[PDB]
Paper text:
[name] is a protozoan parasite that causes diarrhea in humans. The highly compact and uniquely GC-rich Giardia ribosomes possess eukaryotic rRNAs and ribosomal proteins, but retain some bacterial features. Using single-particle cryo-electron microscopy, we have determined high-resolution structures of six naturally populated translocation intermediates, from ribosomes isolated directly from actively growing Giardia cells. The translocation intermediates, with naturally bound tRNAs and eukaryotic elongation factor 2 (eEF2), display characteristic ribosomal intersubunit rotation and small subunit’s head swiveling—universal for translocation.
Unrotated state C (structure C-III) and rotated/ratcheted state D (structures D-I and D-II) represent [name]-T substrates differing in their SSU and [name] conformations. State C contains tRNAs in the classical A (A/A), P (P/P) and E (E/E) states similar to previous bacterial or eukaryotic classical [name]-T complexes. The tRNAs are stabilized through canonical interactions from the A, P or E sites. The acceptor arm of the A-site [name] is at the PTC. Clear density is seen for [name] with the monitoring bases A1410 and A1411 sampling the minor groove between the codon and anticodon of the A-site [name]. The third monitoring base G457 and A1744 of helix 69 (A1913 in E. coli and A2256 in S. cerevisiae) were seen interacting with the codon–anticodon pairs. To understand whether Giardia ribosomes exhibit subunit rolling, we compared the classical [name]-T state ‘C’ with the POST-T state ‘A-I’. A clear 4.6° rotation of the SSU toward the A site could be observed in transition from the POST-T to the [name]-T state, along with formation of the B6 and B8 bridges. We observed ‘subunit rolling’-specific narrowing of the A site by ∼6 Å in the [name]-T state, similar to the earlier report in human ribosomes (∼5 Å).
Numbering used by the authors:
A (entry chain SJ): 2 to 130
B (entry chain SA): 16 to 209
C (entry chain SY): 4 to 88
D (entry chain Sd): 2 to 98
E (entry chain SU): 2 to 122
F (entry chain SB): 28 to 240
G (entry chain Se): 44 to 123
RNA sequence: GCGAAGGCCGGGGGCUAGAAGGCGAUCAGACACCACCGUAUUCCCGGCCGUAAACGGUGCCGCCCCGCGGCCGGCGCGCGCGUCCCGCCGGCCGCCCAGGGAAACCGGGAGGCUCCGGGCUCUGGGGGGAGUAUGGCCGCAAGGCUGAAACUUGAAGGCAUU
RNA sequence: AAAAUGGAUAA
């Protein structure tokens, strides 16, 4: 059984960007995997994305400007205390200055900076750098 | 040019070997009754004219050196080296010609031109160590490693190697405007044959 | 484009900045050997002459080893336009 | 260390092979670890090449030829020199010599 | 059993390419004079002079008939040059090829000029 | 003479500043060139472990000595190269020569606050050589260099004075521990960040091999 | 050739497996047969793995096959 | 639930090999190896037993991952029309691009990890003592499964190079 | 065809 849609899909993005693979393919698509990609495209780590709505699992198209290093998901999706979002940042972030950890908060899918600006905490979904 | 296309079809340059790779499928054209591959000559011109274009970039054409270990060829390289201003590095490659500060044949070329990677692999390998962009001219089976560009060509007959070397040199000099400028070439197609 | 790390003042403070591969955007390495800033030459055509000034393409060291440096080139100069489709 | 990837046998996808015995040792080695080189030879030694045919009354009779596979054990073979101890580089090459 | 030492072989090669005309195919003594002729070459000791002389007489035989590589002669480079720079009296190779290969026709069709379409065919 | 095409260009001054040569990734094989390009305190050096190396042959055992030398300047430059020779001192000289050729540019970094001039490392740069796996983690201003006594001093010559390290493997090996860190320190420039993602440059006529004095 | 997955050449999708297509769907289609009294369309399953019978007749129009079903009488291509 | 081989229980069998046993040579002594003879066994039907270098010494599903291949089972499209050519899937395999690892080397993973987090399960923690003792439990037994401690010792051990 | 052995301790 495909236990996690996001992990395989994020490994596949990263796999394409080591082989260059300007055009990348994600086969199983979930709303969260779209929300992760808009967050990435808005950041600019990935250039853009789309999904071909075949009337089954909706396959996803990924376009990467090629400037990508490691993009992995953190599951088990531990909820993080708002005060200690940084301890997870120390382990998963290259430099406190750059990088992003996408969390899920009630207000909506939000990145590490937005969470501490609102002083809020959420379940870790993944790290994109 | 229809008379050069007739010459290219005469050279049998449009012939290929058994199989191609992901990169080579671009130059592939068709399958014969026996099964070796064939190449579209449009791909031959773009690659050879591109090679002419890229070859004028480095001042001191000895720096755009030529290396080959193919019996049918070497002579064509030895004719190109004469018609252009390049230096041939043929026969035994002397592995470590490019490296070794005290090498009898110290070589530091700025660009490289080969007869093909498979015939002498040391040549293409010796690009990575010495920071050198490398070019070769290959048949349908193409191990395209380290090579900026590669040109589909038979590389099976002295005549085929000769006519692509003639077409390259004619274009290299014509693209420069040094001679010909698309006029009858100063040397014949048969001059480069072994 | 203000490329490079900066202080609170905003001047580039990371000393040397490595160039980027044209096809993968990976930074050409400090001791990477295969990656090269080779130059491609345009022609007047009516002039039929080199104009002395022309574009350069950096082929990343990794792509050279991977073997895709050739198919990358046709695309690199296709967007530039000098090479045909 | 694994001297060879085949691990010394050609057993692939089965997990079992039928077992035979060395012509010499009579050691039982599964079909996969067996030399098995096919033999075809004239029944009288080629030294009696045509001496027999000149002696043979019947016209156009050809000397009978044996067509027997010889199955030897690995241990028996190296000591009878049917195959030698190859070098690390030499082991991968096949091409029956 | 006799095989020559490297010192003799190396010098002998120099003496055969320094002067092929002066050296002799069978006369060891003519070569012996050239081997020990002060400015031409010096061999310390007669036996070493004799050693080079025997080889330079055999090497003279080698150069005379089908010379092995590593030896240079004035005539050899010039004589080779004439054959390499000889182009066919008239290059009859191009002519009209005729006999079209089976699918080669499409490649000419797909580049804008037909190579005498159905004339070589 | 100057043996290399780059070596003559360096003495001539056609290509100047070590940082420019590193930018074009030109292999440097001339020892004399580094001393000419940088005369500032020459290079600070350390002789890390001259190990004893042996080959048992017939009657007795041959004993070469293998030495690893750290040569560096606190301008984001660290040099780690080694040499082995029968003479113990000669090995050190051969190592210093190697240490000159493989001097590697270190990016250097600014932490959460860019208060002044770079003393921190760039990202959590990580390199492994042998079995020793080491990650250089950026550290706060007051944090200095935390690592093995020998590994930390390699960092001081590199010029990072704000780093955190956790090397894992057979660390007792001076040969690969201080070697794995060298891979990490060089990796500093191989890594990339969003400002570095901006596409510019491609000056073309600036190729070191193209330049002729 | 800078084709990307978003628009794959039709032949590529037609060559690949009907599940491994950027748009997955039916490999099979409806192919006509000809019967007594009919010059018009007599559509049938292209890959019938079961017997179809001559309209108003006892004999079976399509032979059973794991793949596309074969026929013993005159037949008409796809849809017309 | 099934599970090689050997064992064992009750019937049968009984050719050949052949645990034991005798025997010759064999050597200092061989009661070992090599001959010769031979019971159990091998064979069969109903039972137990529950082990193996049960091996790919690589758990189980899941997904991406580079070219050259061989075989194999369906399954297609064009060619002249062949048991062709390109392949599409499920396997069987050889070489191996990345990449990994102490390396041998895996690379259809032993890759996508210190830039560590798809899920479920077992199992280990220096080397002996020790699969030992005992407490069970299962078995006709032989034994299997679970499973100690006291005590000792500085190396044991992997792949490599000379 | 027949061949077993070599104290400890440093070198």
């Amino acid at each position: 059984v495909r236990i996690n849609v996001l992990r395989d899909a994020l490994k596949s993005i990263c796999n394409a960007q080591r082989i260059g693979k300007k055009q990348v393919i994600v086969r199983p698509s979930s709303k969260v995997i779209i929300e992760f990609l808009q967050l990435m495209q808005k950041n600019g780590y990935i250039s853009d994305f789309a999904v071909v709505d075949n009337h089954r699992s909706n396959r996803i198209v990924v376009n990467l400007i090629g400037r990508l290093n490691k993009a992995g998901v953190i599951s088990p999706r531990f909820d993080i205390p708002a005060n200690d979002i940084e301890k997870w940042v120390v382990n998963l972030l290259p430099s406190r200055l750059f990088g992003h950890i996408i969390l899920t908060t009630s207000q909506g899918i939000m990145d590490h900076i937005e969470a501490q600006h609102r002083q809020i905490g959420g379940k870790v979904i993944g790290y994109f750098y | 040019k229809e008379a050069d296309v007739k010459k290219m079809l005469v050279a049998t340059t449009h012939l290929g070997v058994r199989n191609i790779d992901r990169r080579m499928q671009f130059y592939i054209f068709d399958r014969q009754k026996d099964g070796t591959f064939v190449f579209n000559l449009q791909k031959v011109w773009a690659k050879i004219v591109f090679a002419a274009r890229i070859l004028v970039t480095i001042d001191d054409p000895a720096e755009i050196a030529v290396v080959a270990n193919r019996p049918d060829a070497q002579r064509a390289i030895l004719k190109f080296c004469k018609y252009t201003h390049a230096t041939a590095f043929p026969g035994r490659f002397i592995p470590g010609n490019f490296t070794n500060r005290m090498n009898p044949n110290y070589c530091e070329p700025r660009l490289l031109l080969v007869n093909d990677p498979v015939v002498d692999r040391q040549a293409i390998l010796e690009a990575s160590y010495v920071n050198i962009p490398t070019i070769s001219l290959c048949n349908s089976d193409a191990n395209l490693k380290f090579i900026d560009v590669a040109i589909p060509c038979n590389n099976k007959t002295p005549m085929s190697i000769g006519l692509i070397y003639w077409l390259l040199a004619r274009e290299v000099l014509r693209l420069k405007g040094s001679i010909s400028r698309t006029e009858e070439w100063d040397v014949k197609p048969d001059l480069f044959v072994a | 484009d203000d490329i490079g790390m900066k202080n609170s003042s905003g001047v580039v403070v990371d000393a040397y900045i490595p160039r980027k591969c044209s096809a993968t955007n990976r930074l050409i390495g400090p001791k990477d050997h295969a990656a090269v800033q080779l130059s491609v030459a345009r022609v007047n055509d009516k002039g039929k002459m080199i104009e002395n000034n022309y574009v350069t393409f950096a082929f990343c060291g990794a792509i050279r080893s991977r073997g895709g440096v050739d198919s990358a080139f046709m695309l690199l100069a296709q967007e530039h336009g000098l090479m045909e489709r | 260390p694994v001297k060879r990837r085949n691990n010394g046998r050609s057993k692939y996808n089965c997990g079992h092979t039928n077992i035979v015995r060395c012509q010499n040792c009579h050691r039982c080695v599964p079909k996969d670890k067996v030399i098995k080189r096919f033999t075809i030879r004239n029944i009288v030694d080629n030294t009696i090449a045509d001496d027999v045919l000149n002696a043979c009354v019947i016209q156009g009779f050809a000397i009978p030829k044996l067509y027997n596979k010889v199955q030897y054990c690995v241990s028996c073979s190296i000591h009878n020199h049917i195959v030698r101890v190859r070098s690390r580089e030499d082991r991968k090459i096949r091409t029956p010599p | 059993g006799k095989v020559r030492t490297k010192t003799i072989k190396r010098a002998a090669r120099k003496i055969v390419e320094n002067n092929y005309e002066s050296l002799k195919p069978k006369d060891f003594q003519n070569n012996k004079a050239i081997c020990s002729k002060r400015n031409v070459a010096i061999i310390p000791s007669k036996r070493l002079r004799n050693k080079v002389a025997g080889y330079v007489t055999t090497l003279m035989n080698r150069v005379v008939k089908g010379p092995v590589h590593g030896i240079s002669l004035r005539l050899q480079e010039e004589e080779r040059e004439r054959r390499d720079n000889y182009a066919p009296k008239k290059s009859e190779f191009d002519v009209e090829n005729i006999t079209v290969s089976g699918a080669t026709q499409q490649m000419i069709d797909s580049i804008g000029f037909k190579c005498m379409s159905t004339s070589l065919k | 003479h100057p043996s290399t095409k780059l070596g003559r260009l360096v003495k001539a001054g056609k290509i100047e500043s070590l940082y420019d040569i590193f930018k074009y990734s030109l292999p440097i094989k001339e020892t004399e060139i580094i001393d000419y390009f940088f005369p500032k305190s020459e290079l600070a050096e350390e002789v890390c472990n001259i190990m004893s190396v042996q080959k048992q042959t017939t009657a007795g055992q041959r004993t070469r000595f293998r030495a690893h030398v750290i040569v560096g300047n606190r301008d984001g430059f660290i040099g780690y190269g080694a040499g082995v020779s029968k003479e113990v001192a000669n090995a050190i000289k051969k190592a210093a020569k190697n240490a000159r050729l493989n001097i590697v540019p270190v990016r250097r970094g600014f932490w959460g606050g860019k208060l002044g001039d770079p003393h921190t490392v760039s990202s959590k740069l990580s390199g492994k050589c042998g079995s020793v796996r080491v990650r250089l983690i950026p550290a706060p201003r007051g944090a200095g260099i935390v690592a093995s006594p020998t590994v930390a001093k390699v960092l001081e010559f590199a010029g990072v004075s704000d780093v955190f390290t956790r090397q894992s493997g057979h660390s007792r090996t001076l040969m690969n521990s201080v070697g794995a860190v060298y891979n990490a320190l060089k990796s500093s420039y191989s890594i990339l960040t969003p400002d570095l993602w901006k596409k510019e440059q491609l000056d073309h006529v600036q190729d070191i091999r193209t330049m002729s004095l | 050739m800078n084709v990307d997955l978003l628009y794959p050449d039709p032949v590529e999708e037609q060559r690949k497996h009907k599940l491994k297509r950027l748009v997955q769907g039916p490999n099979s289609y409806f192919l006509e047969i000809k019967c007594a009294g009919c010059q018009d369309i007599v559509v049938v399953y292209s890959h019938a793995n079961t017997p179809v019978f001559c309209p108003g007749c006892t004999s079976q129009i399509s032979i059973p096959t794991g793949g596309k079903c074969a026929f013993t009488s005159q037949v008409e291509r796809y849809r017309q």
